[PDB]
Design a binder for this molecule. Structure first.
Ligand SMILES: O=C(O)CNC(=O)C(=O)O
Ligand SMILES: [Mg+2]
Ligand code: NI
Ligand SMILES: [Zn+2]
Length: 331
């Protein structure tokens, strides 16, 4: 078996190998990359996502989210308070303010220490899930706005034609902005490109050990666990690496820098934080190997997790028994 310790792999494709997305994902998996839950892909040196980022300040962040923490430094939840709309220019200015900026630090490890020590005592503002793309239409390779769609994958593999579309989303982050422990909707893959700015640190549990994370999470968030059988779909729970180590949960960590791709694999739980002002673009995608994960994915039926028009069709076709009760959560 390739990659039996489930280490995060880093790939360096040539421009020639960067021409066929599906075939490169298949290559990565041949080398065991999926076992970790997360891989990094460094694009060829000749590739660029677009010519410059000089004209992005007028993008609107219609609902910035203030991420308010509760709990203890190692084990907390965050709630997202809606703030008034601001442009990307306004947001970058706010991110760079004395109140919100990244503190002085030695290296990524000192900054990670400061994050886990101090996160709960601040409420950074996140511009998340903004439909859109920053790829130039003339970028032909690994353009997250031109991938083949999950609907077409289901059609090619399974023969069923469904409604729905699949488009990318932009994330504008600042110091301490946080993504809680989750897998993707319907345990899909995701791909994330860091377009500009400061890094993003990721933590990931191997898919083969996801249930161990869930068991710990039920113990650490006992009331949430009673209220919903898949409460990590709410995307509010944080657990530090120290706590994961104390409880024997296998995981890995890696820092993504501007100009690099990350791929998360089906049922790879991940969490992380941003080092300072940045902009990422991400989209879900599927392969043939995904199909059985889609059939087995947990679902939120307390109704908190509340998810897309397009995810309806996936649940209807892959999880017809759940469909009924699931749609009660979403209506
Ligand atoms: O970048 C973020 O804030 C979160 N991204 C993801 O969880 C992802 O790409 O799967
Ligand atoms: Mg603009
Ligand atoms: Ni994700
Ligand atoms: Zn729920």
């Amino acid at each position: 078996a390739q990659n039996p310790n489930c280490n995060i792999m880093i790939f360096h494709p040539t421009k020639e190998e960067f021409n066929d997305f599906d075939k490169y994902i298949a290559y990565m998996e041949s080398q065991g990359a999926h076992r970790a839950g997360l891989a990094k892909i460094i694009p060829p040196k000749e590739w660029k996502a677009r010519e410059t980022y000089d004209n992005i300040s007028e993008i609107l962040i219609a609902t910035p989210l203030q991420q308010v923490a509760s709990g203890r430094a190692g084990v907390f939840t965050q709630y997202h308070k809606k703030k008034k709309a601001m442009t990307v220019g306004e947001y970058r200015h706010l991110a760079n303010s004395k109140k919100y900026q990244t503190p002085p630090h030695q290296n990524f490890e000192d900054l990670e220490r400061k994050y886990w020590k101090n996160r709960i005592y601040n409420s950074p503002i996140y511009g998340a899930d903004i439909s859109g793309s920053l790829f130039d239409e003339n970028t032909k390779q690994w353009n997250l706005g031109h991938l083949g769609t999950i609907q077409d994958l289901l059609e090619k593999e399974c023969g069923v034609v469904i409604e729905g579309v699949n488009t990318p989303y932009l994330y504008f982050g600042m110091w301490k902005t946080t993504f809680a422990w989750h897998t993707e909707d319907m345990d899909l893959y995701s791909i994330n490109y860091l377009h500009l700015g400061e890094p993003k640190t990721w933590y990931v549990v191997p898919p083969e050990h996801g249930q161990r994370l869930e068991r710990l999470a039920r113990e650490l968030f006992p009331g949430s666990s009673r209220g919903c059988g898949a409460f990590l779909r709410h995307k509010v729970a944080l657990i530090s690496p120290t706590v994961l180590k104390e409880n024997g949960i296998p995981f890995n960590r890696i820092t993504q820098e501007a100009g690099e791709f990350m791929v998360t694999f089906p049922y790879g739980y991940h969490a992380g934080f941003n080092h300072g002002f940045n902009c990422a673009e991400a989209i879900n995608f599927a392969t043939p190997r995904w199909i059985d994960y889609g059939k087995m994915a947990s679902q939120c039926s307390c109704g908190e997790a509340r998810v897309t028009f397009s995810m309806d069709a996936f649940v209807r076709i892959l999880q017809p028994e759940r469909y009924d009760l699931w749609k009660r959560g979403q209506d």
